[PDB]
Amino acid sequence: QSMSVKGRIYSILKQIGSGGSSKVFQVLNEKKQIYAIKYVNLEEADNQTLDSYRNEIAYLNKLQQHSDKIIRLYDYEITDQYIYMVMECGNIDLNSWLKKKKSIDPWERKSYWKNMLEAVHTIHQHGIVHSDLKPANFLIVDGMLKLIDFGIANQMQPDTVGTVNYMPPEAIKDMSSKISPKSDVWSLGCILYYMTYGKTPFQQIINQISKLHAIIDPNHEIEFPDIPEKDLQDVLKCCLKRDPKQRISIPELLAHPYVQIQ
Ligand SMILES: Cn1cc(-c2cc3cnc(Nc4ccc(-c5cncn5C)cc4Cl)cc3n2C(=O)OC(C)(C)C)cn1
């Protein structure tokens, strides 16, 4: 197996992941350099779906110049039959990494959070609110976290089917438009809660039905066991404030002692 993108030949090592009509391959160029190639089959794609793909490429392209905590898109091929996205290759996603790494280093978690804040902050300044942030959306690329998904197009799953725990209370209690940047603050807070306490705030809830009521209810107080990083505990408490108005903002989080002090 081998593939061609803009007159450049890439040899397929393995399939990293798949989605709907898409597949992500770990490839090598002629110079033996590693890349992640997302192939999209547009044969049965509707206009709404083609538009999600079109928007992902455009936002991945605009955002390039604004942050290095956003996955690098080196090249792309778009016809009416397919898409090819030549991207940088990361070592592992944060979800698969958090399952393997039992204990998280305080300095690594800190550095990882700075990375997540800068990436989500960049999407916010360009009018994107993700609304479905999970660790799988973050990738470790040379000891750095980069954002790979924008909630624009369908999510890619790894190959060798999703979570409800990172969902904001305003997104669940929506149905009866309240999707603001504050929704991403909650989801990021759940990733940092996972990186601190080894579980998401509502991982305790066995059934998915009762889990949604727990994210909604204010009487269900979230647990914050004492830690030597009192800075981190305040970040965790602020991100997980149920009312979006009281919840901390991304520009506020960047000015927090946890991010700015030793
Ligand atoms: C917009 N978009 C970006 C991507 C995307 C780019 C991309 C670049 N590097 C990687 N490396 C990578 C990531 C994870 C694993 C892995 C999974 N379980 C255990 N392990 C070690 C192995 C590798 Cl080698 C992936 C990339 N993408 C991507 O989706 O990974 C998935 C399908 C994993 C979400 C796909 N769509």
PDB file of C-alpha atoms and ligand atoms in Angstrom:
ATOM      1  CA  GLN A   1       0.000   0.000   0.000  1.00  0.00           C
ATOM      2  CA  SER A   2       1.084   3.566  -0.996  1.00  0.00           C
ATOM      3  CA  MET A   3      -0.649   6.965  -1.705  1.00  0.00           C
ATOM      4  CA  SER A   4      -0.136  10.219  -3.716  1.00  0.00           C
ATOM      5  CA  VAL A   5      -0.863  13.783  -2.597  1.00  0.00           C
ATOM      6  CA  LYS A   6       0.103  16.814  -4.821  1.00  0.00           C
ATOM      7  CA  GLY A   7       2.636  14.759  -6.849  1.00  0.00           C
ATOM      8  CA  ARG A   8       4.219  13.474  -3.575  1.00  0.00           C
ATOM      9  CA  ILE A   9       4.363   9.689  -2.834  1.00  0.00           C
ATOM     10  CA  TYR A  10       3.725   8.461   0.777  1.00  0.00           C
ATOM     11  CA  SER A  11       4.176   4.862   1.922  1.00  0.00           C
ATOM     12  CA  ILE A  12       1.520   3.655   4.448  1.00  0.00           C
ATOM     13  CA  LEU A  13       2.890   2.291   7.753  1.00  0.00           C
ATOM     14  CA  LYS A  14      -0.462   1.643   9.483  1.00  0.00           C
ATOM     15  CA  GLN A  15      -3.997   2.985   9.822  1.00  0.00           C
ATOM     16  CA  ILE A  16      -4.085   5.180  13.039  1.00  0.00           C
ATOM     17  CA  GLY A  17      -7.850   5.751  12.962  1.00  0.00           C
ATOM     18  CA  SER A  18     -11.124   5.818  11.033  1.00  0.00           C
ATOM     19  CA  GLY A  19     -14.455   7.674  11.043  1.00  0.00           C
ATOM     20  CA  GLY A  20     -17.357   7.770   8.615  1.00  0.00           C
ATOM     21  CA  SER A  21     -15.931   7.856   5.073  1.00  0.00           C
ATOM     22  CA  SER A  22     -12.476   8.791   6.443  1.00  0.00           C
ATOM     23  CA  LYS A  23      -9.262   6.954   7.491  1.00  0.00           C
ATOM     24  CA  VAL A  24      -6.070   8.356   9.183  1.00  0.00           C
ATOM     25  CA  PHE A  25      -2.788   6.759   8.153  1.00  0.00           C
ATOM     26  CA  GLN A  26       0.691   6.914   9.677  1.00  0.00           C
ATOM     27  CA  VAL A  27       2.722   7.405   6.428  1.00  0.00           C
ATOM     28  CA  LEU A  28       6.328   8.128   5.261  1.00  0.00           C
ATOM     29  CA  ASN A  29       7.360  10.539   2.458  1.00  0.00           C
ATOM     30  CA  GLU A  30      10.316   9.875   0.065  1.00  0.00           C
ATOM     31  CA  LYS A  31      12.798  11.393   2.640  1.00  0.00           C
ATOM     32  CA  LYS A  32      11.603   8.812   5.314  1.00  0.00           C
ATOM     33  CA  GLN A  33       9.843  11.598   7.338  1.00  0.00           C
ATOM     34  CA  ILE A  34       6.604  10.702   9.229  1.00  0.00           C
ATOM     35  CA  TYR A  35       3.134  12.256   8.554  1.00  0.00           C
ATOM     36  CA  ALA A  36      -0.506  11.578   9.388  1.00  0.00           C
ATOM     37  CA  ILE A  37      -2.672  11.453   6.309  1.00  0.00           C
ATOM     38  CA  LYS A  38      -6.462  11.763   6.583  1.00  0.00           C
ATOM     39  CA  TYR A  39      -8.204  10.245   3.519  1.00  0.00           C
ATOM     40  CA  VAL A  40     -11.917  11.217   3.033  1.00  0.00           C
ATOM     41  CA  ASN A  41     -14.140   9.351   0.520  1.00  0.00           C
ATOM     42  CA  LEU A  42     -16.682  11.932  -0.788  1.00  0.00           C
ATOM     43  CA  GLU A  43     -18.601   9.452  -3.073  1.00  0.00           C
ATOM     44  CA  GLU A  44     -21.768   9.318  -0.907  1.00  0.00           C
ATOM     45  CA  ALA A  45     -21.287  12.735   0.907  1.00  0.00           C
ATOM     46  CA  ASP A  46     -24.220  15.196   1.249  1.00  0.00           C
ATOM     47  CA  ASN A  47     -23.733  19.025   0.951  1.00  0.00           C
ATOM     48  CA  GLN A  48     -24.001  19.520   4.769  1.00  0.00           C
ATOM     49  CA  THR A  49     -21.242  16.853   5.190  1.00  0.00           C
ATOM     50  CA  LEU A  50     -19.023  18.241   2.374  1.00  0.00           C
ATOM     51  CA  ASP A  51     -19.320  21.606   4.151  1.00  0.00           C
ATOM     52  CA  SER A  52     -18.052  20.212   7.504  1.00  0.00           C
ATOM     53  CA  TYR A  53     -14.973  18.866   5.650  1.00  0.00           C
ATOM     54  CA  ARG A  54     -14.505  22.154   3.726  1.00  0.00           C
ATOM     55  CA  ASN A  55     -14.716  24.160   6.989  1.00  0.00           C
ATOM     56  CA  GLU A  56     -12.240  21.893   8.887  1.00  0.00           C
ATOM     57  CA  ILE A  57      -9.567  22.411   6.122  1.00  0.00           C
ATOM     58  CA  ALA A  58     -10.243  26.224   6.073  1.00  0.00           C
ATOM     59  CA  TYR A  59      -9.992  26.591   9.893  1.00  0.00           C
ATOM     60  CA  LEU A  60      -6.993  24.236  10.086  1.00  0.00           C
ATOM     61  CA  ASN A  61      -5.443  26.469   7.346  1.00  0.00           C
ATOM     62  CA  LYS A  62      -6.225  29.902   8.878  1.00  0.00           C
ATOM     63  CA  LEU A  63      -5.267  28.836  12.441  1.00  0.00           C
ATOM     64  CA  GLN A  64      -1.773  27.594  11.304  1.00  0.00           C
ATOM     65  CA  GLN A  65      -0.268  31.118  11.419  1.00  0.00           C
ATOM     66  CA  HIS A  66      -1.797  31.830  14.823  1.00  0.00           C
ATOM     67  CA  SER A  67      -0.609  28.973  17.030  1.00  0.00           C
ATOM     68  CA  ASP A  68       1.832  26.022  17.080  1.00  0.00           C
ATOM     69  CA  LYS A  69      -0.573  24.257  19.575  1.00  0.00           C
ATOM     70  CA  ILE A  70      -2.852  23.548  16.596  1.00  0.00           C
ATOM     71  CA  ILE A  71      -1.934  20.487  14.440  1.00  0.00           C
ATOM     72  CA  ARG A  72       0.108  21.481  11.346  1.00  0.00           C
ATOM     73  CA  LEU A  73      -1.601  20.923   7.936  1.00  0.00           C
ATOM     74  CA  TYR A  74       1.222  20.762   5.351  1.00  0.00           C
ATOM     75  CA  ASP A  75      -0.867  20.048   2.271  1.00  0.00           C
ATOM     76  CA  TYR A  76      -4.323  19.089   1.090  1.00  0.00           C
ATOM     77  CA  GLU A  77      -5.977  17.642  -2.061  1.00  0.00           C
ATOM     78  CA  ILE A  78      -9.728  18.247  -2.617  1.00  0.00           C
ATOM     79  CA  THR A  79     -11.680  16.818  -5.556  1.00  0.00           C
ATOM     80  CA  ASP A  80     -15.384  15.883  -5.776  1.00  0.00           C
ATOM     81  CA  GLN A  81     -14.365  12.219  -5.074  1.00  0.00           C
ATOM     82  CA  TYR A  82     -11.866  12.598  -2.181  1.00  0.00           C
ATOM     83  CA  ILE A  83      -9.849  14.672   0.344  1.00  0.00           C
ATOM     84  CA  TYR A  84      -6.229  14.079   1.478  1.00  0.00           C
ATOM     85  CA  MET A  85      -4.879  16.024   4.451  1.00  0.00           C
ATOM     86  CA  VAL A  86      -1.104  15.745   5.025  1.00  0.00           C
ATOM     87  CA  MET A  87      -0.528  16.590   8.724  1.00  0.00           C
ATOM     88  CA  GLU A  88       2.293  16.340  11.263  1.00  0.00           C
ATOM     89  CA  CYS A  89       2.391  12.974  13.123  1.00  0.00           C
ATOM     90  CA  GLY A  90       2.021  12.904  16.903  1.00  0.00           C
ATOM     91  CA  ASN A  91       3.177  10.052  19.180  1.00  0.00           C
ATOM     92  CA  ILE A  92      -0.225   9.383  20.898  1.00  0.00           C
ATOM     93  CA  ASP A  93      -3.542  11.135  21.706  1.00  0.00           C
ATOM     94  CA  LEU A  94      -4.191  12.325  25.320  1.00  0.00           C
ATOM     95  CA  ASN A  95      -7.012   9.741  25.894  1.00  0.00           C
ATOM     96  CA  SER A  96      -4.843   6.695  25.024  1.00  0.00           C
ATOM     97  CA  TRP A  97      -1.977   8.368  26.981  1.00  0.00           C
ATOM     98  CA  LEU A  98      -4.072   8.930  30.161  1.00  0.00           C
ATOM     99  CA  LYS A  99      -5.120   5.193  30.119  1.00  0.00           C
ATOM    100  CA  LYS A 100      -1.406   4.054  30.022  1.00  0.00           C
ATOM    101  CA  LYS A 101       0.159   6.775  32.329  1.00  0.00           C
ATOM    102  CA  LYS A 102      -1.225   5.882  35.806  1.00  0.00           C
ATOM    103  CA  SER A 103       0.403   8.817  37.742  1.00  0.00           C
ATOM    104  CA  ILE A 104       0.686  12.244  36.022  1.00  0.00           C
ATOM    105  CA  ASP A 105       3.761  14.502  36.739  1.00  0.00           C
ATOM    106  CA  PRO A 106       2.780  17.943  38.264  1.00  0.00           C
ATOM    107  CA  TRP A 107       5.045  19.877  35.784  1.00  0.00           C
ATOM    108  CA  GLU A 108       3.911  17.837  32.747  1.00  0.00           C
ATOM    109  CA  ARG A 109       0.177  18.359  33.641  1.00  0.00           C
ATOM    110  CA  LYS A 110       0.901  22.146  34.059  1.00  0.00           C
ATOM    111  CA  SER A 111       2.703  22.329  30.659  1.00  0.00           C
ATOM    112  CA  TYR A 112      -0.062  20.231  29.028  1.00  0.00           C
ATOM    113  CA  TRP A 113      -2.759  22.638  30.437  1.00  0.00           C
ATOM    114  CA  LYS A 114      -0.868  25.744  29.117  1.00  0.00           C
ATOM    115  CA  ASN A 115      -0.915  24.014  25.658  1.00  0.00           C
ATOM    116  CA  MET A 116      -4.702  23.255  25.902  1.00  0.00           C
ATOM    117  CA  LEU A 117      -5.449  26.851  26.992  1.00  0.00           C
ATOM    118  CA  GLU A 118      -3.413  28.400  24.104  1.00  0.00           C
ATOM    119  CA  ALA A 119      -5.028  26.046  21.517  1.00  0.00           C
ATOM    120  CA  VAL A 120      -8.662  26.578  22.732  1.00  0.00           C
ATOM    121  CA  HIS A 121      -7.917  30.320  23.159  1.00  0.00           C
ATOM    122  CA  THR A 122      -6.839  30.496  19.430  1.00  0.00           C
ATOM    123  CA  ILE A 123     -10.058  28.825  18.183  1.00  0.00           C
ATOM    124  CA  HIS A 124     -12.077  31.264  20.343  1.00  0.00           C
ATOM    125  CA  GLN A 125     -10.469  34.371  18.787  1.00  0.00           C
ATOM    126  CA  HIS A 126     -11.394  33.015  15.315  1.00  0.00           C
ATOM    127  CA  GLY A 127     -15.053  32.520  16.210  1.00  0.00           C
ATOM    128  CA  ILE A 128     -14.924  28.756  16.920  1.00  0.00           C
ATOM    129  CA  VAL A 129     -16.393  27.233  20.072  1.00  0.00           C
ATOM    130  CA  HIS A 130     -15.610  23.464  19.954  1.00  0.00           C
ATOM    131  CA  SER A 131     -18.443  22.357  22.427  1.00  0.00           C
ATOM    132  CA  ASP A 132     -17.283  18.690  22.499  1.00  0.00           C
ATOM    133  CA  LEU A 133     -13.752  18.780  23.977  1.00  0.00           C
ATOM    134  CA  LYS A 134     -12.304  15.399  25.083  1.00  0.00           C
ATOM    135  CA  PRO A 135      -8.627  14.185  25.536  1.00  0.00           C
ATOM    136  CA  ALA A 136      -8.823  12.301  22.173  1.00  0.00           C
ATOM    137  CA  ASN A 137      -9.005  15.835  20.538  1.00  0.00           C
ATOM    138  CA  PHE A 138      -5.480  16.575  21.926  1.00  0.00           C
ATOM    139  CA  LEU A 139      -2.282  15.015  20.573  1.00  0.00           C
ATOM    140  CA  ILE A 140       1.290  14.656  22.035  1.00  0.00           C
ATOM    141  CA  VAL A 141       3.740  15.940  19.359  1.00  0.00           C
ATOM    142  CA  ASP A 142       7.405  16.103  20.623  1.00  0.00           C
ATOM    143  CA  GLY A 143       6.378  16.572  24.316  1.00  0.00           C
ATOM    144  CA  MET A 144       3.746  19.212  23.497  1.00  0.00           C
ATOM    145  CA  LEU A 145      -0.096  19.087  23.306  1.00  0.00           C
ATOM    146  CA  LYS A 146      -1.662  20.173  19.973  1.00  0.00           C
ATOM    147  CA  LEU A 147      -5.384  20.446  19.169  1.00  0.00           C
ATOM    148  CA  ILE A 148      -6.428  18.226  16.228  1.00  0.00           C
ATOM    149  CA  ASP A 149     -10.313  18.488  16.087  1.00  0.00           C
ATOM    150  CA  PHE A 150     -12.646  21.600  16.129  1.00  0.00           C
ATOM    151  CA  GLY A 151     -16.070  19.949  16.516  1.00  0.00           C
ATOM    152  CA  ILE A 152     -16.581  21.119  12.866  1.00  0.00           C
ATOM    153  CA  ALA A 153     -16.383  17.688  11.178  1.00  0.00           C
ATOM    154  CA  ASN A 154     -17.147  14.125  12.471  1.00  0.00           C
ATOM    155  CA  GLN A 155     -14.712  12.809  15.179  1.00  0.00           C
ATOM    156  CA  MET A 156     -12.044  10.205  14.289  1.00  0.00           C
ATOM    157  CA  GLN A 157     -11.765   7.036  16.422  1.00  0.00           C
ATOM    158  CA  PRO A 158      -8.397   5.153  16.891  1.00  0.00           C
ATOM    159  CA  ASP A 159      -7.918   1.695  15.263  1.00  0.00           C
ATOM    160  CA  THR A 160      -5.765  -1.238  16.586  1.00  0.00           C
ATOM    161  CA  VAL A 161     -17.823   4.862  20.907  1.00  0.00           C
ATOM    162  CA  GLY A 162     -17.710   8.226  22.794  1.00  0.00           C
ATOM    163  CA  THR A 163     -17.999   9.843  26.271  1.00  0.00           C
ATOM    164  CA  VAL A 164     -20.707  11.991  28.067  1.00  0.00           C
ATOM    165  CA  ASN A 165     -18.474  13.051  31.104  1.00  0.00           C
ATOM    166  CA  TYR A 166     -16.859  16.181  29.480  1.00  0.00           C
ATOM    167  CA  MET A 167     -20.321  17.650  28.547  1.00  0.00           C
ATOM    168  CA  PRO A 168     -21.177  21.135  29.977  1.00  0.00           C
ATOM    169  CA  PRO A 169     -24.356  21.608  32.133  1.00  0.00           C
ATOM    170  CA  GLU A 170     -25.697  24.347  29.763  1.00  0.00           C
ATOM    171  CA  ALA A 171     -25.364  21.968  26.726  1.00  0.00           C
ATOM    172  CA  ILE A 172     -27.342  19.148  28.476  1.00  0.00           C
ATOM    173  CA  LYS A 173     -30.041  21.474  29.986  1.00  0.00           C
ATOM    174  CA  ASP A 174     -30.304  23.331  26.598  1.00  0.00           C
ATOM    175  CA  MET A 175     -33.342  21.421  25.120  1.00  0.00           C
ATOM    176  CA  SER A 176     -36.817  22.419  26.499  1.00  0.00           C
ATOM    177  CA  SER A 177     -28.871  29.389  21.858  1.00  0.00           C
ATOM    178  CA  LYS A 178     -26.600  28.987  24.969  1.00  0.00           C
ATOM    179  CA  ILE A 179     -23.290  27.691  23.393  1.00  0.00           C
ATOM    180  CA  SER A 180     -20.558  30.151  24.470  1.00  0.00           C
ATOM    181  CA  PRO A 181     -16.730  29.835  24.937  1.00  0.00           C
ATOM    182  CA  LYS A 182     -17.582  29.019  28.643  1.00  0.00           C
ATOM    183  CA  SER A 183     -18.787  25.546  27.440  1.00  0.00           C
ATOM    184  CA  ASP A 184     -15.170  24.721  26.393  1.00  0.00           C
ATOM    185  CA  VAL A 185     -13.915  25.904  29.832  1.00  0.00           C
ATOM    186  CA  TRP A 186     -16.052  23.169  31.499  1.00  0.00           C
ATOM    187  CA  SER A 187     -14.801  20.384  29.107  1.00  0.00           C
ATOM    188  CA  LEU A 188     -11.151  21.522  29.646  1.00  0.00           C
ATOM    189  CA  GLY A 189     -11.815  21.508  33.412  1.00  0.00           C
ATOM    190  CA  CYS A 190     -12.925  17.819  33.202  1.00  0.00           C
ATOM    191  CA  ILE A 191      -9.629  16.933  31.331  1.00  0.00           C
ATOM    192  CA  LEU A 192      -7.592  18.692  34.105  1.00  0.00           C
ATOM    193  CA  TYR A 193      -9.788  16.972  36.787  1.00  0.00           C
ATOM    194  CA  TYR A 194      -8.917  13.631  35.002  1.00  0.00           C
ATOM    195  CA  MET A 195      -5.190  14.669  34.935  1.00  0.00           C
ATOM    196  CA  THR A 196      -5.297  15.511  38.689  1.00  0.00           C
ATOM    197  CA  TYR A 197      -7.644  12.981  40.322  1.00  0.00           C
ATOM    198  CA  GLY A 198      -7.362  10.091  37.790  1.00  0.00           C
ATOM    199  CA  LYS A 199     -11.111  10.182  36.979  1.00  0.00           C
ATOM    200  CA  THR A 200     -13.559  12.659  35.335  1.00  0.00           C
ATOM    201  CA  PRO A 201     -15.928  14.500  37.815  1.00  0.00           C
ATOM    202  CA  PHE A 202     -18.936  12.218  37.048  1.00  0.00           C
ATOM    203  CA  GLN A 203     -17.060   8.926  36.267  1.00  0.00           C
ATOM    204  CA  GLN A 204     -18.718   7.697  39.544  1.00  0.00           C
ATOM    205  CA  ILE A 205     -22.151   7.599  37.745  1.00  0.00           C
ATOM    206  CA  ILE A 206     -22.435   4.036  36.283  1.00  0.00           C
ATOM    207  CA  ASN A 207     -25.485   4.675  34.003  1.00  0.00           C
ATOM    208  CA  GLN A 208     -25.401   7.447  31.321  1.00  0.00           C
ATOM    209  CA  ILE A 209     -29.053   8.529  32.109  1.00  0.00           C
ATOM    210  CA  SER A 210     -28.395   9.356  35.822  1.00  0.00           C
ATOM    211  CA  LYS A 211     -24.962  10.867  34.775  1.00  0.00           C
ATOM    212  CA  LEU A 212     -26.707  13.691  32.783  1.00  0.00           C
ATOM    213  CA  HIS A 213     -28.922  14.580  35.805  1.00  0.00           C
ATOM    214  CA  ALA A 214     -25.673  14.850  37.896  1.00  0.00           C
ATOM    215  CA  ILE A 215     -24.097  17.433  35.510  1.00  0.00           C
ATOM    216  CA  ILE A 216     -27.412  19.396  35.656  1.00  0.00           C
ATOM    217  CA  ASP A 217     -28.233  19.269  39.452  1.00  0.00           C
ATOM    218  CA  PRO A 218     -26.553  21.908  41.678  1.00  0.00           C
ATOM    219  CA  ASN A 219     -27.206  19.788  44.849  1.00  0.00           C
ATOM    220  CA  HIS A 220     -24.726  17.203  43.449  1.00  0.00           C
ATOM    221  CA  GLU A 221     -21.516  18.865  44.806  1.00  0.00           C
ATOM    222  CA  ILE A 222     -18.324  17.876  42.849  1.00  0.00           C
ATOM    223  CA  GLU A 223     -15.462  16.417  44.996  1.00  0.00           C
ATOM    224  CA  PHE A 224     -12.126  18.289  45.217  1.00  0.00           C
ATOM    225  CA  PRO A 225      -9.728  16.246  47.481  1.00  0.00           C
ATOM    226  CA  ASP A 226      -6.904  18.439  48.953  1.00  0.00           C
ATOM    227  CA  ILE A 227      -3.658  18.575  46.878  1.00  0.00           C
ATOM    228  CA  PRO A 228      -0.187  20.242  47.330  1.00  0.00           C
ATOM    229  CA  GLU A 229      -1.074  22.458  44.314  1.00  0.00           C
ATOM    230  CA  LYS A 230      -3.643  24.850  45.881  1.00  0.00           C
ATOM    231  CA  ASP A 231      -3.373  26.843  42.584  1.00  0.00           C
ATOM    232  CA  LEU A 232      -4.635  23.778  40.613  1.00  0.00           C
ATOM    233  CA  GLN A 233      -7.550  23.195  43.029  1.00  0.00           C
ATOM    234  CA  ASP A 234      -8.812  26.769  42.386  1.00  0.00           C
ATOM    235  CA  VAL A 235      -8.541  26.217  38.576  1.00  0.00           C
ATOM    236  CA  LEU A 236     -10.535  22.946  38.911  1.00  0.00           C
ATOM    237  CA  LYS A 237     -13.222  24.581  41.105  1.00  0.00           C
ATOM    238  CA  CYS A 238     -13.586  27.619  38.744  1.00  0.00           C
ATOM    239  CA  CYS A 239     -13.827  25.598  35.471  1.00  0.00           C
ATOM    240  CA  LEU A 240     -16.440  23.311  37.022  1.00  0.00           C
ATOM    241  CA  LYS A 241     -18.741  26.203  38.147  1.00  0.00           C
ATOM    242  CA  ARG A 242     -22.204  25.041  36.801  1.00  0.00           C
ATOM    243  CA  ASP A 243     -23.469  28.597  35.939  1.00  0.00           C
ATOM    244  CA  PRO A 244     -21.533  29.719  32.766  1.00  0.00           C
ATOM    245  CA  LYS A 245     -21.639  33.357  33.976  1.00  0.00           C
ATOM    246  CA  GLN A 246     -19.750  32.437  37.229  1.00  0.00           C
ATOM    247  CA  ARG A 247     -17.400  29.966  35.429  1.00  0.00           C
ATOM    248  CA  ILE A 248     -13.905  31.365  34.689  1.00  0.00           C
ATOM    249  CA  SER A 249     -12.992  32.581  31.167  1.00  0.00           C
ATOM    250  CA  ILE A 250     -10.054  31.510  28.933  1.00  0.00           C
ATOM    251  CA  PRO A 251      -8.420  35.053  29.188  1.00  0.00           C
ATOM    252  CA  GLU A 252      -8.942  34.806  33.006  1.00  0.00           C
ATOM    253  CA  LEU A 253      -7.378  31.254  33.100  1.00  0.00           C
ATOM    254  CA  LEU A 254      -4.281  32.565  31.228  1.00  0.00           C
ATOM    255  CA  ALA A 255      -3.713  35.134  34.015  1.00  0.00           C
ATOM    256  CA  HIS A 256      -4.111  32.577  36.853  1.00  0.00           C
ATOM    257  CA  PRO A 257      -1.202  31.874  39.272  1.00  0.00           C
ATOM    258  CA  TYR A 258      -1.342  28.157  38.240  1.00  0.00           C
ATOM    259  CA  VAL A 259      -0.284  29.109  34.637  1.00  0.00           C
ATOM    260  CA  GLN A 260       1.937  32.155  35.466  1.00  0.00           C
ATOM    261  CA  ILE A 261       3.745  31.384  38.762  1.00  0.00           C
ATOM    262  CA  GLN A 262       6.851  29.021  39.182  1.00  0.00           C
TER     263      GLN A 262
HETATM  264  C1  LIG B   1      -8.374  17.029  11.570  1.00  0.00           C
HETATM  265  N1  LIG B   1      -7.800  15.700  11.866  1.00  0.00           N
HETATM  266  C2  LIG B   1      -6.575  15.499  12.471  1.00  0.00           C
HETATM  267  C3  LIG B   1      -6.364  14.116  12.511  1.00  0.00           C
HETATM  268  C4  LIG B   1      -5.160  13.496  13.029  1.00  0.00           C
HETATM  269  C5  LIG B   1      -3.891  13.929  12.764  1.00  0.00           C
HETATM  270  C6  LIG B   1      -2.968  13.070  13.431  1.00  0.00           C
HETATM  271  C7  LIG B   1      -1.584  13.089  13.584  1.00  0.00           C
HETATM  272  N2  LIG B   1      -0.925  12.216  14.346  1.00  0.00           N
HETATM  273  C8  LIG B   1      -1.632  11.192  15.000  1.00  0.00           C
HETATM  274  N3  LIG B   1      -0.854  10.245  15.756  1.00  0.00           N
HETATM  275  C9  LIG B   1      -1.292   9.174  16.590  1.00  0.00           C
HETATM  276  C10 LIG B   1      -2.379   9.305  17.481  1.00  0.00           C
HETATM  277  C11 LIG B   1      -2.748   8.256  18.272  1.00  0.00           C
HETATM  278  C12 LIG B   1      -2.090   7.014  18.237  1.00  0.00           C
HETATM  279  C13 LIG B   1      -2.653   6.017  19.112  1.00  0.00           C
HETATM  280  C14 LIG B   1      -4.007   5.697  19.301  1.00  0.00           C
HETATM  281  N4  LIG B   1      -4.133   4.798  20.365  1.00  0.00           N
HETATM  282  C15 LIG B   1      -2.834   4.568  20.809  1.00  0.00           C
HETATM  283  N5  LIG B   1      -1.937   5.249  20.102  1.00  0.00           N
HETATM  284  C16 LIG B   1      -0.485   5.229  20.283  1.00  0.00           C
HETATM  285  C17 LIG B   1      -0.986   6.793  17.355  1.00  0.00           C
HETATM  286  C18 LIG B   1      -0.612   7.885  16.537  1.00  0.00           C
HETATM  287 CL1  LIG B   1       0.640   7.625  15.358  1.00  0.00          CL
HETATM  288  C19 LIG B   1      -3.053  11.059  14.916  1.00  0.00           C
HETATM  289  C20 LIG B   1      -3.722  12.043  14.132  1.00  0.00           C
HETATM  290  N6  LIG B   1      -5.106  12.337  13.890  1.00  0.00           N
HETATM  291  C21 LIG B   1      -6.191  11.644  14.472  1.00  0.00           C
HETATM  292  O1  LIG B   1      -7.323  11.906  14.164  1.00  0.00           O
HETATM  293  O2  LIG B   1      -5.886  10.675  15.398  1.00  0.00           O
HETATM  294  C22 LIG B   1      -6.918   9.820  16.036  1.00  0.00           C
HETATM  295  C23 LIG B   1      -7.570   8.958  14.976  1.00  0.00           C
HETATM  296  C24 LIG B   1      -6.093   8.983  16.988  1.00  0.00           C
HETATM  297  C25 LIG B   1      -7.951  10.630  16.792  1.00  0.00           C
HETATM  298  C26 LIG B   1      -7.539  13.530  11.911  1.00  0.00           C
HETATM  299  N7  LIG B   1      -8.413  14.509  11.528  1.00  0.00           N
END
